[PDB]
Design a protein around this motif. Structure first.
Motif, mmCIF file in Angstrom:
data_model
loop_
_atom_site.group_PDB
_atom_site.id
_atom_site.type_symbol
_atom_site.label_atom_id
_atom_site.label_comp_id
_atom_site.label_asym_id
_atom_site.label_seq_id
_atom_site.Cartn_x
_atom_site.Cartn_y
_atom_site.Cartn_z
ATOM 1 N N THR A 122 0.790 -1.226 0.000
ATOM 2 C CA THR A 122 0.000 0.000 0.000
ATOM 3 C C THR A 122 0.818 1.270 0.000
ATOM 4 O O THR A 122 0.371 2.305 -0.496
ATOM 5 C CB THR A 122 -0.963 -0.004 1.198
ATOM 6 N N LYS A 123 2.069 1.188 0.456
ATOM 7 C CA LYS A 123 3.006 2.281 0.418
ATOM 8 C C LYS A 123 3.115 2.771 -1.017
ATOM 9 O O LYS A 123 3.455 3.923 -1.256
ATOM 10 C CB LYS A 123 4.298 1.724 0.931
ATOM 11 N N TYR A 124 2.837 1.918 -2.008
ATOM 12 C CA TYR A 124 2.952 2.348 -3.381
ATOM 13 C C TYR A 124 1.701 2.938 -4.008
ATOM 14 O O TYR A 124 1.681 3.197 -5.214
ATOM 15 C CB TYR A 124 3.459 1.174 -4.177
ATOM 16 N N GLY A 125 0.629 3.134 -3.245
ATOM 17 C CA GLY A 125 -0.539 3.839 -3.732
ATOM 18 C C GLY A 125 -1.579 3.007 -4.456
ATOM 19 O O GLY A 125 -2.767 3.091 -4.136
ATOM 20 N N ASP A 126 -1.190 2.262 -5.483
ATOM 21 C CA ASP A 126 -2.122 1.405 -6.183
ATOM 22 C C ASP A 126 -1.306 0.232 -6.680
ATOM 23 O O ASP A 126 -0.073 0.302 -6.826
ATOM 24 C CB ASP A 126 -2.817 2.129 -7.392
ATOM 25 N N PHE A 127 -2.031 -0.831 -7.006
ATOM 26 C CA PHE A 127 -1.494 -2.048 -7.576
ATOM 27 C C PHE A 127 -0.537 -1.843 -8.746
ATOM 28 O O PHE A 127 0.556 -2.412 -8.830
ATOM 29 C CB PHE A 127 -2.671 -2.911 -8.006
ATOM 30 N N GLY A 128 -0.946 -0.971 -9.659
ATOM 31 C CA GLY A 128 -0.188 -0.754 -10.888
ATOM 32 C C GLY A 128 1.157 -0.106 -10.626
ATOM 33 O O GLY A 128 2.024 -0.194 -11.477
ATOM 34 N N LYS A 129 1.295 0.593 -9.495
ATOM 35 C CA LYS A 129 2.566 1.129 -9.086
ATOM 36 C C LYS A 129 3.331 0.012 -8.369
ATOM 37 O O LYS A 129 4.526 -0.204 -8.606
ATOM 38 C CB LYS A 129 2.392 2.280 -8.133
ATOM 39 N N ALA A 130 2.672 -0.785 -7.519
ATOM 40 C CA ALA A 130 3.344 -1.864 -6.794
ATOM 41 C C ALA A 130 4.109 -2.823 -7.689
ATOM 42 O O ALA A 130 5.176 -3.337 -7.332
ATOM 43 C CB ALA A 130 2.328 -2.667 -5.988
#
Ligand SMILES: CCN[C@H]1CN(CCOCC)S(=O)(=O)c2sc(S(N)(=O)=O)cc21
Ligand SMILES: [Hg+2]
Ligand SMILES: [Zn+2]
Length: 256
Positions: A122-130
């Protein structure tokens, strides 16, 4: 394009996803005798009480149950993880016979199927960023052996009729994924990749030691799905598992 058939199976994926030949590809063999017991490893914390499933979908590769990941509803923390990872979906890979189907093997033993509960950091904001991050995803992997029926799997087994072919979806609200967990949360962990394309090296793999058993009737039902869309020639969805990859300088850590 890719699949698990002679012509477009694992052995070919490297031609379009060159990372298939990389340094931390999944799945791998867990050799129990050389895995390092690590006592700095914390317990897993699975908080699946408030998880919201929405939909089951046959995507041509497997069927996925998807969850609402808009708020911290079902999260995984602890273990080798720093941070909170949200459950976005779960799927399985299974075989055409009972002695194959798992992707990960334990001392070269293959199971009938394997559940993957996919989570993103979740630190990355959304799945597509993860999926652009070395530690973007954590997949909880659970081996399934044929034996007694798993009560909580039946609900999934019943709907498979509705989603027999590629591109079909059914609503699937109120499923409690806690009914798929074993008694023990002891695990092995290592850094790896997605086992399907795009084969991204984004994942901390948490592979639980204890299997869940399902009946042959239940996993039989898995085998009746189709890889094809409606009105295409029927190809049964079986053996949607990638073979073990070389560990290439990684150490599997054990919590026990
Ligand atoms: C059929 C494609 N399956 C993929 C779909 N992934 C999205 C990939 O693209 C993101 C840009 S995913 O994160 O949901 C995911 S997790 C696993 S596995 N077997 O390793 O647990 C496979 C897959
Ligand atoms: Hg990545
Ligand atoms: Zn998977």
């Amino acid at each position: 394009h890719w699949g698990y058939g002679k012509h477009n199976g694992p052995e070919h994926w490297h031609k379009d996803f060159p990372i298939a030949k990389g340094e931390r590809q999944s799945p791998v063999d867990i050799d129990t005798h050389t895995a390092k017991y690590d006592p700095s490893l914390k317990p897993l914390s699975v908080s699946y009480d408030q998880a919201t499933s929405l939909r089951i979908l046959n995507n041509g590769h497997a069927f996925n149950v998807e969850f609402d990941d808009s708020q911290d509803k079902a999260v995984l923390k602890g273990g080798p993880l720093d941070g909170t990872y949200r459950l976005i979906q779960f799927h399985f890979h299974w075989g055409s016979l009972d002695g194959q189907g798992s992707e990960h093997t334990v001392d070269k033993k293959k199971y009938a199927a394997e559940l993957h509960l996919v989570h993103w950091n979740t630190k990355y904001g959304d799945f597509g960023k993860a999926v652009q991050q070395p530690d973007g995803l954590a997949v909880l992997g659970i081996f399934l052996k044929v034996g007694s029926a798993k009560p909580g799997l039946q609900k999934v087994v019943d709907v498979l009729d509705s989603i027999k072919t590629k591109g079909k979806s059914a609503d699937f609200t109120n499923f409690d994924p806690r009914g798929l967990l074993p008694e023990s949360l002891d695990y092995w962990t290592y850094p790896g990749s997605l086992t399907t394309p795009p084969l991204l090296e984004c994942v901390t793999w948490i592979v639980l030691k204890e299997p869940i058993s399902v009946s042959s009737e239940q996993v039989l039902k898995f085998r009746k799905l189709n890889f094809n869309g409606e009105g295409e020639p029927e190809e049964l969805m079986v053996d949607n598992w990638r073979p073990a990859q070389p560990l290439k300088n990684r150490q599997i850590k054990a919590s026990f």
